[PDB]
Enzyme design. Structure first.
Site, short mmCIF file in Angstrom:
data_model
loop_
_atom_site.label_atom_id
_atom_site.label_comp_id
_atom_site.label_asym_id
_atom_site.label_seq_id
_atom_site.Cartn_x
_atom_site.Cartn_y
_atom_site.Cartn_z
N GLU A 138 49.78 1.81 31.75
CA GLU A 138 48.29 2.17 31.04
C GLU A 138 48.35 1.50 29.73
OE1 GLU A 138 45.26 3.14 31.53
OE2 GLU A 138 46.65 3.50 33.07
N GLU A 197 44.80 11.31 27.56
CA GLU A 197 44.12 11.44 27.86
C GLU A 197 44.10 9.90 29.57
OE1 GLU A 197 40.42 11.53 26.45
OE2 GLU A 197 40.25 10.16 25.63
N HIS A 198 44.73 8.78 28.73
CA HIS A 198 44.85 8.75 29.66
C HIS A 198 46.05 8.73 30.57
CE1 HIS A 198 42.70 4.82 28.62
NE2 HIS A 198 43.01 4.80 28.12
N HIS A 231 44.61 10.04 22.18
CA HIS A 231 43.98 9.65 23.49
C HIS A 231 45.10 8.76 24.23
CE1 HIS A 231 40.66 7.00 24.43
NE2 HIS A 231 41.93 5.53 24.68
N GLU A 236 42.29 -4.53 26.92
CA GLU A 236 40.95 -3.71 26.66
C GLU A 236 40.38 -4.82 24.50
OE1 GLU A 236 39.76 -0.70 27.72
OE2 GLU A 236 41.02 0.99 26.43
#
Ligand SMILES: CCCCCCCCCCCCCCCCCC(=O)OC[C@H](COP(=O)([O-])OCC(O)COP(=O)([O-])OC[C@@H](COC(=O)CCCCCCCCCCCCCCCCC)OC(=O)CCCCCCCCCCCCCCCCC)OC(=O)CCCCCCCCCCCCCCCCC
Ligand SMILES: CCCCCCCCCCCCCCCCCC(=O)OC[C@H](COP(=O)([O-])OCC(O)COP(=O)([O-])OC[C@@H](COC(=O)CCCCCCCCCCCCCCCCC)OC(=O)CCCCCCCCCCCCCCCCC)OC(=O)CCCCCCCCCCCCCCCCC
Ligand SMILES: CCCCCCCCCCCCCCCCCC(=O)OC[C@H](COP(=O)([O-])OCC(O)COP(=O)([O-])OC[C@@H](COC(=O)CCCCCCCCCCCCCCCCC)OC(=O)CCCCCCCCCCCCCCCCC)OC(=O)CCCCCCCCCCCCCCCCC
Ligand SMILES: CCCCCCCCCCCCCCCCCC(=O)O[C@@H](COC(=O)CCCCCCCCCCCCCCC)COP(=O)(O)OCC[N+](C)(C)C
Ligand SMILES: CCCCCCCCCCCCCCCCCC(=O)OC[C@H](COP(=O)(O)O)OC(=O)CCCCCCCCCCCCCCCCC
Ligand SMILES: CCCCCCCCCCCCCCCCCC(=O)OC[C@H](COP(=O)(O)O)OC(=O)CCCCCCCCCCCCCCCCC
Ligand code: HEC
Ligand code: HEC
Ligand SMILES: COC1=C(OC)C(=O)C(C/C=C(\C)CC/C=C(\C)CC/C=C(\C)CC/C=C(/C)CCC=C(C)C)=C(C)C1=O
Ligand SMILES: [Zn+2]
Lengths: 441, 50, 122, 48, 464, 108, 59, 55, 50, 70
Positions: E145, E75-76, E72, E152
């Site tokens: 990132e 893809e950042h 995951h 979040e």
């Protein structure tokens, strides 16, 4: 027991290729249009897709509303495809769900659209269901009374987005006449609504010369021959309140808006009727695309803006091209200054790479709108209703044949015309309105 | 009247006429409970609200 | 038996008219209509059809019901000037109830139940 | 209006009636009460 | 009776033969490179747009406890600059071809794809290979990132349905690789670096696990040449480290269990109940598709929910048991999940739970033929709707080559669907549902959700 | 309210004091309360009777006679218990005939 | 660890109308075994004291 | 309307009528509804001429 | 819908918030009263026989 | 308790501003005649059926006793 052959293995000798491969057509199919003897225009385009889409476009929308019938298009979006003179609501729902078809009712600012999407094997069923649900609809008292609640939460949810409210107030400020009426009305507008109001609105908007039947992936001769006894319509054309662009400025007061929204708009001369002006307006919309999300998780940072959202609407005879930008509550004057600077720098000239990029963005949007069968049917129906023909090839040619000098001339002619200015939010910082509409003069 | 007649007949002696009358009363009791109440009632509903 | 049934159809109409006349003469002494006899607690089709009516009709029906119940408590009848205006065969519920019953018949032929239940008070 | 009123109105179709499998599964309870009664009384070798 | 308005259509569900729709459906061509990478195209005759991308048989399942969350995070990072193109260069070149790049990362599948026009096939191939093979993976972008993901995570910024489904996967697949979340824990994000990303891409992004699938307006031979030029340098795979060996080494395990995530002042009550379903290669997966269509789904913005064919949709819409619900059928390489997810509040949660359990157990005993014919027609129509969008065609090509090993033809799929009848539905429901353990997950206002024994008791009937 | 604080008083209030009843009920709706009164009377008279009755052959007839002639108020108790069965059945029969006349057993 | 067999589950356990008669025959045989064990233990312990022992002794 | 005020006295009126009939039956005609044969002690070897139950 | 507007959680890395954002597959139950079987143990339970 | 939509005006008078039992002596014959007019047909039907069938049965019983009479 059932089948036990695993899906990595091929299925056995009871798996036949008995249908042969039908040869492809020689050329790309063209749009073929005609008119019924009742006066309803029928246009269709053949596709190789196994999905046939049938849509019925009726002139109306918010532009045909009155103060008595206010918010009738939003109610008609929910109340459509219910009990008719020949079928009950239960029978129509089961007949749609038996063939796996889907139905929609969609109200614009100058039209209402009703559509049924199904496979190519059930096109007669889809056509019959759509025609019966449109022409012979009953609009009973209890069904409209029970649908009014869901209408109220759908409007209340759609007004939660500030861009919808800014778009409503911008259309109110830009136009006087039909196009200035509100589509997404307040929920309390339809508090006294009844089925008589909807029946009155439907009787006003319905006329044979204001109805277009558009189909995708349907043979045209068969469609006209089987829709002639179904779309024999009667009625009188209720007068249309033709709209005119005047411009101006307004405001909105929002008590708990965490941001502040500013809208700037101009008039696209000629509306949807002129191919070249609409193409230039689409190119201008793409040139105003500052932060387009072309990649996942990319963080483009602006000094002042939080969101930029341009648009280009092309109605009949007139249009509205512009941009809406957000920002912090304390930086609203900076948002206005940056928007004026962006439009002025557009008027100062576009430089080759930007022109090619905006032309490619406009071409990609135009071709991705008609990629699927329902999108192609909607595009054909809207273009035939607004103009009388479908000219996507001509729109693509106009987009590709556009020079930077033509775009610079277009923006120069735009900034001379009086603009439209709308704000939003708990407005505690604003430059005075006279100096707001001075920077383009 | 049928039920009250059956109440009167139970205190008498067994006689061919009383046997015949009691059989007729029992038959009419079953006829009213099982034939009159559904069918005549349905006819009344069809007359009043049909 | 269809030939005898055809003769029985004007007989059915005659008995229906005679019954309706006698009951309506009995009905008009309380101001009631024929459609006022139908009970939502007794019939769920009537309970659903009464939900489909505009509220002024329901108010008028409730007023007629309260007037008749007051008259029954008083062991009285309507005054003659008021009794001459009564129309016990005027229909307000018949088309709505007929369409509800037709809907329930059409759902039952495909296996679906009625989308409304009985009324429960607990 | 539960009972004969349901069949007079046409609410009892071939559909909405129990299936053959449903009636067989309900009908299989006939052996259970017979076996339970024979277990309770125990009349052994009483079958003629 | 209207003469023209009442022909051709009736509410009686009858089986439809979809055989004449197969005459004009396009064909899939597959070419296997010496690398082991398959190149598969499907040319739509008059298409103007093209969807193309790279589908990888990898994801969160094939990670470890130490690097959970690397796929995951990839893809950042991957779109933030390569070794041949910068951020702005990539942005300008993507903008000039008029499309958008996109990425999805599942538990077992990953795709990176581009939706462009037909004139930009080679440019999209070159760009996709450039991000896939020559990425910078800069430490400054990783630090830029990490903090956003940590904010979040601290805010609990998540969808409610994704929260419930992650709890469901965690409690149904305890002590197996499928119980990990795609996002990963907070500590792995707090201690991520460039080395783990390099090692993950080096281990898993290999030739036999990668499909280049393109649909729309595309020539097969030209895509073969472009893929051999661009993607020809990917490493091959060792036989000892294949996907099947990893599946055998760490298998999936299903445990009947219960979890709820209680909040003190929440409004909604989301809940999902699932049974152990079928893997992708099980032949019982087609009847599970039909059963999922039979259960259907509904949300309260529709007003024709009381006239639904589905009895569960009818019950929930008529009694108002839930604001929205949906039946799901999740398939993995060696297991699956079948059940119903819904959103309600605390006063209607038990009755919604009872409706779910009673409609699931009812399919073992009474199934009528009209419902099966209706669901078969709806499922075939849903399959025909995916053929309309080239994005779904490319996604199905990539998925079918990764998980079935081959491109299932449309005639075989229609024949396999048409072989399902009511006895098959009763048998599959008896196999998967009746008197079996289930997994229960809920979140929100869940104080009135029944416990596990209530759910376990209602998987069987004592009256038959 | 005082009846809102004890649950016994709330039930008694709800079902015997404030219970909403149609106002046009005639005197043929008094069968049920009369039947309940007759049931209570039969229970009271019988419980009093069972203190002087012996349930054995060769004592039962003599115990009833001793009840009739020697127990104070015993003749009243026996005759009340004997005729109360008749009045109980009269009242319950008229109650059933009322329900038959009005269709009182229908839905719900 | 120890687990009931699937084939034995599908026969005597999946339906209550098959489970209940099996339950009754098992109940019958369990009562017979308990009766036998109790009677054998009682007669073995009290041998020579019962009435039947005296009667069989007088034969 | 409320039960406890309006239908208490209405039940009391009918209860007083029932008490009048009950008092008449007890004090003036105590053996009217019975059978005279039940004042004979039971004899299993001799049967009465007419065997009828209560009314 | 978003969980911040629907569930409205507290902000922070509390023990409940960590499991809410990323639940773990290594669930530990209490084993003082009952020891668990190995995970993924299949078959119809032996408790029916008992 | 239910909500009944209703439009009315209700007037009630005190029990102590009215007579209690003085219109009973005036309405007594009208009540008697109205009761017998309203329930006349059913009471007559019950009486005719009961007494006619009882009289027929009693007459036939007397005839059957006379037929065996010596
Ligand atoms: C052992 C044999 C029982 C049997 O044959 O069960 C068949 C029958 C069918 O049950 P099922 O369809 O398998 O499951 C129930 C449904 O899921 C439907 O269950 P539900 O979620 O709607 O709730 C029903 C619930 C609640 O049911 C009720 O309405 C209350 C039941 C009251 C019974 C308890 C009274 C105890 C004595 C006081 C008098 O019933 C129970 O708690 C289970 C059965 C109660 C015993 O079960 C019963 O209802 C038992 C009947 C009662 C006799 C024992
Ligand atoms: C000497 C005998 C003649 C008395 C004179 C009668 C003329 C005035 C009648 C009248 O209106 O009196 C007012 C009034 C009678 O009330 P109502 O509003 O006429 O309603 C009673 C009728 O039976 C109204 O009954 P309904 O309208 O409900 O008719 C149905 C009834 C038909 O009832 C009858 O035709 C009479 C029962 C024949 C057996 O069907 C039955 O046979 C069902 C059995 C119910 C027993 C009724 C007592 O007189 C009293 O206040 C009498 C008080 C009785 C208290 C004791 C109740 C239980 C012992
Ligand atoms: C046989 C005679 C009955 C023939 C029909 C008749 O006279 O109508 C009943 C008549 C009431 O007629 P109404 O004004 O149309 O009342 C209708 C209500 O249903 C009547 O009112 P309600 O049914 O709601 O209950 C009240 C009813 C309560 O009275 C009854 O339930 C009737 C029994 C009254 C005793 C009459 C003796 C004859 C039978 C024993 O009437 C009275 O209060 C009677 C007046 C009290 C007598 C003096 C007290 C000291 O009551 C009478 O007995 C008339 C009073 C003359 C007394 C006669 C000595
Ligand atoms: C008849 C009485 C009940 C018989 C027992 C019974 O039905 O068992 C109950 C539970 O048993 C009880 O609670 C009853 C125990 C006492 C039994 C007493 C029986 C009395 C018989 C008297 C003679 C008649 C439920 O289990 P079944 O559905 O029959 O078994 C299958 C269950 N499962 C699908 C989950 C594997
Ligand atoms: C008086 C008429 C009856 C009669 O003559 O009986 C002989 C009987 C006496 O017979 P004897 O000894 O021959 O005079 O009379 C009575 O004592 C009966 C009086 C009450 C009438 C019965 C009414 C209630 C019972 C019927 C309802 C039961 C069904 C409900 C459903
Ligand atoms: C049309 C065909 C039917 C389909 C619709 C009806 C339906 O589905 O049914 C639901 C129906 C209501 O649904 P609705 O009518 O659709 O609102 O419910 C009932 O069936 C209720 C029935 C009430 C009567 C129960 C009878 C009990 C019999 C045994 C009683 C035992 C004695 C108890 C007391 C003893 C003393 C202690
Ligand atoms: C076979 C029928 C039947 C029998 C026997 C019966 N009841 Fe009733 N009862 C009814 C019905 C039906 C009603 C409802 C009547 C109505 O509301 O129209 C009712 C109503 C009542 C009422 C309310 C007031 C009234 O009279 O309407 C009471 C109190 C009552 N019953 C008590 C009793 C008692 C106490 C007994 C016996 C000891 C009894 N009932 C025997 C059927 C019966
Ligand atoms: C429905 C009717 C009914 C009810 C209720 C009833 N009984 Fe009686 N009982 C009778 C009848 C009838 C007799 C016979 C009386 C006679 O003919 O002397 C009787 C006789 C008796 C006798 C024998 C003495 C005698 O004088 O006959 C006793 C003791 C008795 N009942 C006790 C009770 C008791 C105790 C209760 C309640 C707890 C009760 N009864 C309720 C009908 C009833
Ligand atoms: C249609 O409208 C209605 C009526 O019609 C107007 C009614 O009539 C009634 C019911 C009437 C009732 C409950 C009162 C009648 C009396 C009954 C049923 C019982 C009789 C009891 C008496 C006289 C006293 C008993 C005394 C004692 C001490 C026993 C209790 C024992 C202990 C505390 C240990 C109801 C509900 C009704 O809705
Ligand atoms: Zn993630």
């Amino acid at each position: 027991g059932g089948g036990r052959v695993e899906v990595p293995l091929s299925e056995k000798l009871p798996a036949v290729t008995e249908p042969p491969r039908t040869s492809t057509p020689a050329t790309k199919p063209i749009v073929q249009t005609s008119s019924l003897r009742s006066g309803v225009k029928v246009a269709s385009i053949n596709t190789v897709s196994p999905i046939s889409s049938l849509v019925l476009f009726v002139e109306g929308g918010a532009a045909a509303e009155t103060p008595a019938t206010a918010g009738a298009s939003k109610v008609l979006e929910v109340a459509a495809f219910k009990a008719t003179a020949n079928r009950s609501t239960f029978r129509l729902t089961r007949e749609l769900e038996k063939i796996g078809a889907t139905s929609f009712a969609r109200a614009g600012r100058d039209h209402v659209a009703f559509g049924v999407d199904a496979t190519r094997l059930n096109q007669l069923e889809a056509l019959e269901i759509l025609a019966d649900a449109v022409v012979n609809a009953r609009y009973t008292y209890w069904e409209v009374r029970d649908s009014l609640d869901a209408v109220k939460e759908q409007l209340a949810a759609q007004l939660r987005n500030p861009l919808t409210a800014v778009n409503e107030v911008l259309h109110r400020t830009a136009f006087e006449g039909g196009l200035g009426h509100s589509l997404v009305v307040d929920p309390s507008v339809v508090d006294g609504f009844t089925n008589e109001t909807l029946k009155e609105y439907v009787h006003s908007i319905m006329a044979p010369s204001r109805v277009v039947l558009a189909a995708s992936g349907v043979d045209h001769a068969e469609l006209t021959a089987l829709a002639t006894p179904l779309l024999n319509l009667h009625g009188n054309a209720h007068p249309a309140p033709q709209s005119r662009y005047v411009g101006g400025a307004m405001n909105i007061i929002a008590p708990t808006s965490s941001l502040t929204y500013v809208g700037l708009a101009f008039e696209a001369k000629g509306g949807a009727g002129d191919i070249k002006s609409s193409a230039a307006a689409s190119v201008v919309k793409a040139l105003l695309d500052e932060a387009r999300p072309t990649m996942p998780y990319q963080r483009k940072e602006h000094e002042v803006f939080t969101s930029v959202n341009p648009f280009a609407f092309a109605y009949k005879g007139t249009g509205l091209v512009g941009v809406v930008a957000s920002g912090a509550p304390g930086k609203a004057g900076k948002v206005v200054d940056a928007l004026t600077a962006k439009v002025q720098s557009l008027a100062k000239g576009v430089t080759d790479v930007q022109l090619a990029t905006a032309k490619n963005m406009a071409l990609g949007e135009l071709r991705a709108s008609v990629a699927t069968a329902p999108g192609l049917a909607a595009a054909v129906g809207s273009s035939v209703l607004a103009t009388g023909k479908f000219s996507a090839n001509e729109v693509a040619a106009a987009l590709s044949g556009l020079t930077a000098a033509d775009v610079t001339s277009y923006v120069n002619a735009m900034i001379k015309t009086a603009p439209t200015f709308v704000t939003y939010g708990n407005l505690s910082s604003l430059p005075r309105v006279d100096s707001i509409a001075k920077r383009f003069a | 009247a049928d039920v009250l007649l059956l109440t009167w007949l139970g205190g008498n002696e067994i006689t061919p006429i009383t046997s015949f009358v009691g059989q007729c009363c029992t038959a009419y009791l079953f006829f009213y409970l099982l034939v009159c109440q559904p069918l005549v009632g349905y006819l009344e509903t069809q007359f009043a609200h049909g | 038996t269809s030939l005898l049934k055809q003769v029985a159809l004007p007989v059915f109409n005659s008995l229906a008219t005679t019954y309706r006349s006698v009951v309506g003469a009995k009905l008009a002494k309380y101001g009631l209509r024929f459609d006022d006899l139908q009970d939502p607690l007794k019939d769920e089709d009537v309970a659903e059809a009464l939900r489909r009516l505009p509220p002024d009709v329901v108010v008028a029906r409730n007023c007629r019901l309260r007037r008749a119940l007051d008259l029954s408590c008083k062991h009285e009848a309507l005054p003659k000037d008021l009794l001459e205006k009564q129309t016990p065969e005027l229909s307000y519920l018949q088309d709505v109830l007929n369409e509800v019953r037709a809907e329930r018949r059409e759902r039952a032929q495909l296996g679906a139940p009625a989308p409304y239940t009985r009324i429960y008070y607990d | 209006p539960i009972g004969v009123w349901s069949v007079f109105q046409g609410y009892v179709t071939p559909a909405r009636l129990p299936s053959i499998q449903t009636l067989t599964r309900v009908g299989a309870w006939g052996g259970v009460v017979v076996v339970g009664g024979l277990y309770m009384v125990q009349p052994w070798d009483w079958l003629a | 009776d209207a003469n023209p308005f009442l022909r051709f259509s009736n509410p009686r569900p009858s089986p439809i033969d979809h055989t004449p729709l197969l005459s004009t459906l396009p064909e899939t061509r597959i070419t296997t490179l010496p690398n082991g990478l398959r190149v598969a195209t499907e040319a739509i005759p008059f298409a103007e747009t093209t969807t193309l991308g790279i589908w990888i048989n990898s994801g969160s399942r094939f990670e470890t406890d130490a690097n959970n969350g690397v796929a995951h995070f990839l893809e950042h990072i991957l779109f933030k600059g390569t070794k041949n193109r910068s951020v702005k260069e990539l942005e300008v070149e993507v903008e000039n071809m008029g499309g958008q790049l996109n990425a999805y990362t599942g538990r077992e599948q990953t795709c990176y794809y581009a939706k462009v026009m037909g004139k930009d096939v080679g440019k999209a191939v070159n760009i996709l290979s450039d991000i896939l093979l020559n990425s910078n993976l800069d430490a400054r972008a990783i630090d830029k990132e990490r903090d956003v993901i940590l904010r979040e995570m601290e805010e609990v910024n998540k969808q409610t349905s994704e929260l419930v489904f992650d709890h469901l996967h965690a409690t149904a697949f305890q002590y197996s690789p499928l119980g990990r979340t795609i996002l990963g824990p907070v500590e792995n994000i707090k201690s991520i670096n460039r080395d783990q990303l390099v090692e993950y891409m080096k281990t898993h992004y290999r030739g036999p696990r990668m499909v280049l699938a393109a649909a729309g307006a595309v020539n097969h031979d030209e895509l073969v040449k472009l893929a051999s030029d661009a993607f020809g340098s990917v490493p091959d795979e060792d036989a000892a480290t294949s996907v099947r060996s990893l599946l055998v080494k760490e298998p999936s395990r299903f445990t009947g269990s219960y979890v709820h995530d209680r909040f003190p002042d929440a409004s909604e009550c989301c809940m999902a109940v699932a049974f152990k379903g079928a893997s992708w290669t099980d032949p019982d997966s087609i009847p599970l598709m039909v059963m999922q269509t039979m259960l259907g789904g509904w949300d309260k913005n529709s007003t024709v929910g009381k006239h639904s064919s589905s009895a569960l949709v009818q019950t929930v819409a008529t009694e108002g048991l839930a604001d929205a619900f949906m039946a799901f059928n999740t398939n993995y390489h060696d297991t699956g999940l079948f059940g119903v997810y819904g959103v309600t509040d605390r006063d209607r949660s038990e009755d919604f739970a009872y409706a779910i359990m009673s409609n699931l157990t009812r399919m073992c005993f009474e199934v009528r033929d009209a419902d099966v014919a209706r669901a078969k027609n709806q499922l075939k129509a849903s399959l025909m709707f995916f053929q309309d969008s080239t994005h779904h065609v490319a996604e199905s090509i990539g998925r079918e080559l990764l998980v079935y090993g081959r491109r299932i033809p449309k005639a075989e799929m229609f024949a396999r669907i048409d072989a399902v009848d009511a006895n098959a539905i009763r048998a599959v429901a008896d196999r998967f549902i009746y008197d079996q353990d289930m997994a229960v997950a809920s979140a929100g206002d869940v104080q009135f959700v029944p416990d596990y024994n209530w759910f376990r008791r209602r998987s069987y009937w004592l009256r038959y | 309210r005082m009846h809102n604080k004890i649950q016994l008083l709330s039930v008694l209030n709800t079902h015997l004091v404030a219970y909403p009843t149609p106002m046009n009920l005639n005197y043929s709706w008094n069968g049920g309360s009369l039947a309940g009164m007759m049931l209570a009377s039969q229970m009271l008279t019988g419980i009093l009777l069972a203190m002087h009755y012996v349930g054995h052959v060769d004592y039962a007839f003599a115990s009833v006679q001793h009840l009739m002639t020697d127990v104070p108020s015993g003749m009243i108790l026996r005759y009340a218990h004997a005729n109360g069965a008749s009045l109980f059945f009269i009242v319950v029969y008229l109650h059933v005939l009322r329900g038959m006349y009005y269709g009182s057993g229908a839905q719900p | 660890v120890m687990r009931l067999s699937e084939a034995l589950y599908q026969t005597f356990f999946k339906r209550s109308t098959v489970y209940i008669p099996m339950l009754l025959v098992g109940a019958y045989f369990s009562n017979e075994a308990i009766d036998y064990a109790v009677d054998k233990m009682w007669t073995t312990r009290n041998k020579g004291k019962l009435f039947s022992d005296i009667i069989a002794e007088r034969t | 309307i409320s039960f406890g005020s309006y239908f208490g006295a209405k039940d009391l009126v009918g209860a007083l009528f029932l008490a009048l009939v009950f008092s008449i039956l007890v004090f003036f005609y105590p053996d009217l509804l019975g059978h005279p044969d039940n004042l004979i002690p039971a004899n299993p070897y001799s049967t009465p001429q007419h065997i009828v139950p209560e009314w | 819908s978003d969980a911040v507007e629907v569930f409205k959680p507290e902000t922070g890395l509390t023990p409940t918030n960590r499991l809410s954002m990323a639940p773990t597959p290594y669930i530990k139950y209490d084993e003082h009263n009952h020891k668990r079987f190995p995970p993924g143990t299949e078959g119809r339970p032996f408790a029916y026989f008992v | 308790r239910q909500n009944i939509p209703l439009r009315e005006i209700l007037y009630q008078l005190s029990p102590y501003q009215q007579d209690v039992i003085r219109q009973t002596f005036t309405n007594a014959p009208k009540t008697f005649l109205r009761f017998f007019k309203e329930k006349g047909v059913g009471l007559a039907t019950f009486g005719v059926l009961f007494f006619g069938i009882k009289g027929y049965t009693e007459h036939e019983m007397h005839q059957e006793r006379l037929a065996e009479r010596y």
